[PDB]
Design a protein around this ligand. Structure first.
Ligand SMILES: CCCCCCCCCCCCCCCCCC(=O)OC[C@H](COP(=O)([O-])OCC(O)COP(=O)([O-])OC[C@@H](COC(=O)CCCCCCCCCCCCCCCCC)OC(=O)CCCCCCCCCCCCCCCCC)OC(=O)CCCCCCCCCCCCCCCCC
Ligand SMILES: CCCCCCCCCCCCCCCCCC(=O)OC[C@H](COP(=O)([O-])OCC(O)COP(=O)([O-])OC[C@@H](COC(=O)CCCCCCCCCCCCCCCCC)OC(=O)CCCCCCCCCCCCCCCCC)OC(=O)CCCCCCCCCCCCCCCCC
Ligand SMILES: CCCCCCCCCCCCCCCCCC(=O)OC[C@H](COP(=O)([O-])OCC(O)COP(=O)([O-])OC[C@@H](COC(=O)CCCCCCCCCCCCCCCCC)OC(=O)CCCCCCCCCCCCCCCCC)OC(=O)CCCCCCCCCCCCCCCCC
Ligand SMILES: CCCCCCCCCCCCCCCCCC(=O)OC[C@H](COP(=O)([O-])OCC(O)COP(=O)([O-])OC[C@@H](COC(=O)CCCCCCCCCCCCCCCCC)OC(=O)CCCCCCCCCCCCCCCCC)OC(=O)CCCCCCCCCCCCCCCCC
Ligand SMILES: CCCCCCCCCCCCCCCCCC(=O)OC[C@H](COP(=O)([O-])OCC[N+](C)(C)C)OC(=O)CCCCCCCCCCCCCCCCC
Ligand SMILES: Nc1ncnc2c1ncn2[C@@H]1O[C@H](COP(=O)(O)OP(=O)(O)OP(=O)(O)O)[C@@H](O)[C@H]1O
Ligand SMILES: [Mg+2]
Lengths: 105, 231, 74, 161, 256, 108
């Protein structure tokens, strides 16, 4: 399928219009909305919500679509001693100690 | 952008940002056994068990219309918990509500379950509509894959994978291909792909690459302006 | 003309229910309209037909008297 | 790719044109379908200012039309005198007199000032929400710094040996 | 036995206590498992809310009165109150005061029937506070790990043995009361932490307290016994023994 | 007796454990099958559900699944005390003992 030039932008951004005299007096009040259809656009409510359960749930959903992702999901839900799937890294204790146990060889 | 300048915006007669016990004249006052003859009170200690049963009811009565969709059942549970965890996480001191916050929230959820038992709750109708549009889009991707065809999502990923290789083959001085750089590459493709949906790609020019589309256009003869005058 | 208008206004209520059937039937907030609409509709029909039926009886009583009384006077 | 489900549940009493539940949103759509869309004028002057002479004719035509039809216009004027005096002397203070006499009664002004500030917040909705996300993007990027360290551990172990 | 009982399967011992904020009743009774969309009937039939209130509020309330109809068949409710109402009903047209004097004994009869037919409700928070103070019970049971397997509590019919309770051989009291207002039941408990079970049997009776005319406690446990069963240990705990309790306090003998 | 599974009507089957070793295996499979459970292999008989990402509301969903598999009718008063794997095993034992002694299901 055709993609055009990556360096260029859509033509809507490049098209322009200029004014002249006389000019229509009318000032637009609202944007026209003749047909109530807003498909394929995500809700703007999903703006500044903090991290929560939906993040690790949707992560597994997209990870399970790949071979490597399926291995990560099954390993984490089985062989990781954590009281929550909302993993937050605030220290490198588990990272550094996992390196000293491997770099000895 | 714009901040509220009034420093007393959150002040109430009951304190700062107090939405649990607004100050009124008929304030709660204690009762003494020795001096009380009779009393008419509706408060009891049944809200905890009613909170547990309401969850079991709202959860089970909603799964009746999920048709065994396992991913929808787990999504609904996460959404149902966000509705029951409101009193535990809110800024409002729900343990200091005027006449018992536990009773108030339990009676509020019972009104929700009553609508749930009739399959008329707006959360239910919203779930059916959202899931049907999602399954229609997944069935479209499945029917294209069964035909050996490439999906629109797979073509974007393969196109994004090759642009990263091109941008990193010229990035030798630096070697940190940050997530910021990856994002603006994908967003630029997205804007051109989004504009390509309303104006598809005919030639090498690509999606929305025709200047003639933005010349003066008129409504077709078989579809005039239905709502207003044209001249 | 009165009986025909009130019959059409009653039929207008039947259209208003049919146009809004799904809400009157499934939304429990409109249960009282669903339950008592036919009771009011029957009471409305009862008044329309009662007046027509009573007027019809009086016209027939009037017509049969003037004919019988006229032959006695002849 | 697993075969997804054919369809979810379809409610037998909910449609887009006849929604089962009620809200002001659906009433808003039916309202603007009734009054129609904004009647955009393509001209350079408004209709009233371009026809002031002609509108003055029809305005006076209908005044004379009512005046020629109303033979007893003097009886209507006299019958209107008492209610005109009564309702204006009774409601003068609450409408206009309050602005320079005993009490201001600024209740209606407080609602305008609150709406003017809300109008301004909506005007800067993009800037305010973008500043809120920048702090969340800062926290998210701070958590992604750990995966960048582990990816280089293999290079460190290779050169360390 | 619980007098108020609907076709609802869950929480039988709380059905009369729980006051739901429902406008009307749920379409179906509480499901015991996930069902199919075709299992339930969409858009329940017309006049469904009126039918539900009759079978979930009216009908179980009448079954409560019928189950305990033997507690209201006293000579006061049967002969005296209706006989008094008929005496003044013969002069109901003479003045308004006769209509009131003929209707008051009817309202008084309803109130005695209404209170006597309710389920016997003891102060359960007093009971759990009493069993959690015993060291032999707290060894195997705790509030956070205890669960109820069976509950029974019902009034005792007729007058009891006229040697253990001579109080009820009173002709003046028998004119108003046909039963003894005492109740008896048990509690099947289990502990999910220790794996132990016990049957908490109890007998109650109304007692006077601290005052001349008012009853002190309508349900005073004068006999409270626990048959604790464990893995291989069977213990029998006696919280309140009736031989020691009946020598100190006597029943109240409700009138009216 | 039938339920929808991924859009297909499948007859639901019931289990009868009547053995201590089978109850422990069922509860572990039950808790591991829950999508919110963390550290599924670290789960044992003495595992607190709180240590595996489960709260009071997750115990209700687990109790709801026990009613589906075993046909129990668990009251709302019993659910909030099921906070460990051992609690589910002992409760199932108490229900089987109650029906074997009293010939009826416990009060719901
Ligand atoms: C300045 C001019 C002055 C001139 C005077 C006249 C002014 C004009 C009046 C116009 C208003 C009346 C319209 C009459 C029909 C006109 C054609 C038309 O509707 O426009 C084209 C219309 C399209 O509308 P549109 O504007 O192009 O776009 C619609 C929008 O997209 C959105 O689609 P939508 O479907 O949502 O839109 C609905 C649309 C159109 O919806 C309709 O389908 C119109 C239906 C109107 C029926 C009115 C009640 C009649 C009841 C039936 C009686 C039948 C008796 C038969 C007897 C023998 C058989 C047993 O709007 C209406 O509903 C108009 C109704 C007006 C309110 C009437 C309510 C009266 C209650 C108050 C009482 C007042 C007393 C007077 C009552 C008079 C009664 C006679 O065409 C259609 O709708 C096709 C419909 C095909 C299926 C219908 C099959 C028949 C079903 C009938 C209903 C059965 C109900 C139960 C039976 C009750 C009796 C037993
Ligand atoms: C058989 C022989 C007889 C039949 C022969 C045929 C004759 C047919 C006659 C019809 C004539 C052709 C119709 C053309 C349209 C109507 C004429 C017109 O001026 O509309 C343009 C004018 C706007 O035209 P535009 O310049 O393109 O608008 C630009 C801006 O958007 C506008 O807003 P802006 O603020 O952005 O710009 C400034 C704006 C500033 O002006 C305004 O904005 C006006 C502010 C008033 C709105 C405040 C709220 C009050 C109204 C609320 C809603 C009330 C109605 C609904 C509630 C009740 C429901 C029944 O416009 C102006 O510069 C001045 C406007 C014109 C001068 C003042 C007009 C006074 C007379 C017209 C109103 C009549 C009221 C009723 C009296 C009649 C007794 C029933 O429309 C209006 O202002 C409202 C009138 C809407 C039509 C209703 C009246 C129709 C019949 C009028 C006939 C001539 C007057 C006769 C009585 C004179 C008494 C002194
Ligand atoms: C407890 C309330 C008063 C009760 C007294 C009886 C009623 C008042 C009659 C006389 C009115 C003069 C006072 C102006 C009151 C204006 C209040 C007002 O209109 O609301 C504005 C207010 C917001 O507008 P605003 O502009 O911010 O108000 C500030 C004013 O503009 C002005 O700003 P401000 O900060 O200066 O206002 C503070 C307020 C301070 O008020 C207080 O703090 C109350 C005083 C403490 C309590 C004393 C009463 C003790 C009662 C117990 C004893 C009773 C014994 C009875 C027998 C025993 C029975 C057992 O007013 C005063 O300062 C009063 C001092 C008067 C100055 C006198 C100077 C000498 C004048 C000599 C010439 C007099 C010519 C007068 C001509 C004839 C009159 C037109 O709206 C509301 O608050 C809505 C909620 C309503 C509040 C509760 C109801 C109070 C009555 C409101 C009227 C009805 C509203 C509800 C319907 C609304 C439509 C659906
Ligand atoms: C065309 C189609 C439509 C037709 C519609 C018309 C047809 C309607 C039919 C109505 C008749 C059938 C309904 C009742 C069937 C029950 C049959 C039965 O076998 O039940 C036995 C059954 C015993 O069950 P069990 O436990 O198996 O028995 C085991 C042993 O046998 C237990 O051994 P035990 O030793 O413990 O004995 C227990 C037994 C003891 O039974 C007795 O000893 C009999 C005592 C009856 C006394 C009645 C007279 C009271 C006054 C006498 C005073 C005399 C001395 C003073 C004289 C002063 C003179 C001024 O207790 C009772 O059963 C008596 C309960 C209360 C009855 C008295 C109600 C007084 C109402 C007064 C107004 C009467 C108006 C009548 C209508 C006439 C005007 C229109 O008892 C019941 O089921 C009770 C049912 C509920 C009570 C119904 C009584 C009426 C309540 C409605 C309240 C409104 C009353 C009317 C007021 C109207 C004006 C405001
Ligand atoms: C003399 C001839 C008969 C005279 C006419 C008698 C008419 C009696 C019925 C009309 C009056 C009813 C009162 C309505 C207001 C109270 C509603 C109510 O009852 O709530 C129940 C209430 C329900 O309890 P509740 O209202 O406190 O709430 C329950 C608590 N929660 C919500 C937590 C569950 O129960 C009772 O009050 C006790 C039973 C009262 C029985 C009512 C009258 C039954 C009479 C039976 C007559 C049968 C013969 C006639 C018919 C035969 C067939 C044709
Ligand atoms: N201290 C109190 N203050 C105000 N009202 C009260 C108080 N105690 C009870 N009430 C009201 O009287 C009703 C009866 O109280 P009661 O103790 O019998 O309830 P209960 O559920 O049986 O308690 P328990 O579980 O201990 O047996 C209550 O529902 C309540 O509305
Ligand atoms: Mg009690």
């Amino acid at each position: 399928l055709q993609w055009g030039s990556l360096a260029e932008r859509p033509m809507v951004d490049r098209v322009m219009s200029t004014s002249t005299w006389p000019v229509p007096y009318y000032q637009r009040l609202f944007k026209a909305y003749p047909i109530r259809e807003k498909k394929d656009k995500m809700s703007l409510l999903l703006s500044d919500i903090d991290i929560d359960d939906t993040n690790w749930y949707q992560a597994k959903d997209f990870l399970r679509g790949s071979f490597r992702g399926r291995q990560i999901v099954d390993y984490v839900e089985n062989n990781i001693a954590s009281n929550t799937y909302i993993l937050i890294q605030q220290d490198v204790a588990n990272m550094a100690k996992a390196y000293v146990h491997d770099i000895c060889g | 952008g714009y901040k509220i300048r009034n420093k007393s915006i959150f002040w109430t007669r009951a304190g700062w940002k107090n939405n649990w016990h607004p100050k009124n004249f008929n304030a709660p006052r204690p009762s003494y056994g020795e001096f009380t003859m009779g009393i008419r009170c509706r408060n009891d200690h049944h809200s905890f068990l009613r909170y547990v049963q309401t969850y079991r009811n709202m959860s089970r009565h909603c799964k009746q219309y999920f048709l065994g969709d396992k991913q929808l059942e787990e999504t609904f549970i996460l959404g149902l918990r966000s509705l029951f965890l409101v009193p535990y996480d809110s800024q409002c001191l729900t343990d200091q509500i005027k006449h018992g916050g536990e009773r108030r929230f339990v009676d509020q959820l019972d009104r929700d379950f009553e609508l749930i038992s009739y399959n008329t709750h707006p959360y239910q109708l919203f779930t059916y509509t959202v899931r049907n549009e999602h399954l229609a889009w997944k069935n479209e991707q499945y029917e294209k894959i069964q035909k050996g065809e490439k999906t629109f999502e797979q073509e974007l990923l393969d196109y994004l994978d090759e642009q990263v290789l091109a941008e990193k083959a010229k990035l030798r001085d630096g070697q940190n291909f940050s997530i910021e750089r990856m994002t603006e590459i994908a967003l630029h493709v997205f804007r051109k792909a989004r504009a390509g949906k309303v104006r598809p790609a005919q030639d090498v020019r690509g999606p929305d690459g025709n200047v003639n589309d933005f010349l003066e256009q008129r409504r077709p003869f078989e579809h005039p302006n239905p709502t207003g005058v044209t001249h | 003309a009165t009986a025909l208008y009130k019959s059409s206004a009653l039929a207008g209520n039947l259209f208003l229910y049919a146009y809004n059937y799904n809400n009157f039937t499934a939304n429990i907030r409109l249960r009282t309209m669903r339950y008592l609409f036919p009771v009011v509709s029957l009471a409305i029909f009862g008044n329309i037909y009662w007046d027509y039926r009573s007027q019809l009886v009086k016209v027939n009583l009037f017509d049969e008297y003037i004919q019988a009384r006229a032959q006695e006077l002849v | 790719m697993k075969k997804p489900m054919a369809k979810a549940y379809e409610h037998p009493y909910n449609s887009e044109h006849h929604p089962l539940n009620f809200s002001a949103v659906k009433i808003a759509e039916t309202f603007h379908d009734f009054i129609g869309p904004e009647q955009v004028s393509p001209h350079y002057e408004s209709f009233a200012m371009s026809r002031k002479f002609l509108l003055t004719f029809w305005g006076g035509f209908f005044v004379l039309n009512f005046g020629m039809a109303t033979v007893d216009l003097n009886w209507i004027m006299k019958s209107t005198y008492i209610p005109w005096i009564f309702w204006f002397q009774l409601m003068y203070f609450y409408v206009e007199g309050k602005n320079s006499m005993f009490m201001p009664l600024l209740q209606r002004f407080y609602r305008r000032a609150a709406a003017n500030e809300i109008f301004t917040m909506e005007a800067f909705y993009h800037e305010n929400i973008e500043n809120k996300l920048r702090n969340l993007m800062r926290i998210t990027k701070g958590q992604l710094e750990y995966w960048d360290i582990h990816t280089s551990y293999g290079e460190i172990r290779a050169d360390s040996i | 036995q619980m007098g108020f009982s609907s076709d609802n399967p869950y929480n039988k011992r709380w059905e009369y206590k729980w006051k739901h904020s429902y406008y009307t009743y749920p379409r179906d009774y509480e499901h015991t498992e996930v069902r199919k969309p075709q299992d339930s009937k969409d858009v329940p039939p017309i006049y469904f809310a009126y039918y539900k209130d009759f079978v979930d509020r009216w009908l179980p309330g009448m079954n409560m009165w019928w189950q305990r109809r033997h507690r209201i068949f006293d000579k006061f409710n049967v002969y005296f109150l209706p006989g008094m109402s008929l005496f003044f009903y013969q002069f109901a047209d003479l003045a308004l005061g006769f209509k009131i004097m003929a209707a008051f004994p009817l309202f008084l009869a309803y109130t005695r029937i209404r209170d006597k037919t309710l389920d016997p409700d003891f102060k359960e928070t007093y009971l759990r506070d009493m069993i959690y103070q015993n060291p032999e019970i707290t060894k195997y049971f705790n509030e956070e790990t205890i669960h109820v397997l069976d509950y029974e509590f019902e009034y005792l019919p007729g007058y009891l043995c006229p040697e253990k309770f001579p109080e009820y051989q009173n002709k003046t009291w028998q004119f108003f009361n046909t039963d003894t207002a005492q109740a008896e039941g048990f509690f099947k408990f289990g502990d999910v932490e220790s794996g132990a079970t016990m049957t908490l049997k109890f007998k109650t009776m109304p007692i006077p307290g601290k005052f001349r005319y008012q009853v002190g406690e309508p349900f005073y446990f004068y006999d409270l016994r626990a048959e604790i069963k464990c893995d291989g240990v069977y213990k029998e705990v006696v919280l309140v023994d009736e031989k020691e309790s009946l020598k100190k306090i006597r029943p109240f003998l409700f009138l009216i | 007796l039938t339920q929808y599974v991924e859009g297909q009507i499948v007859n639901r089957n019931q289990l009868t454990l009547k053995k201590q070793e089978d109850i422990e295996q069922y509860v572990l499979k039950l808790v591991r099958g829950y999508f919110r459970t963390t550290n599924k292999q670290g789960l044992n008989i003495n595992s607190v559900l709180q240590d595996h990402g489960l709260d009071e509301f997750d115990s209700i969903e687990l109790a709801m699944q026990v009613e589906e598999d075993l046909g129990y009718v668990i009251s709302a008063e019993t659910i909030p005390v099921l906070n460990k794997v051992k609690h589910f095993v002992n409760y199932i034992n108490h229900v089987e003992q109650f029906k074997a002694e009293n010939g009826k299901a416990p009060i719901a």
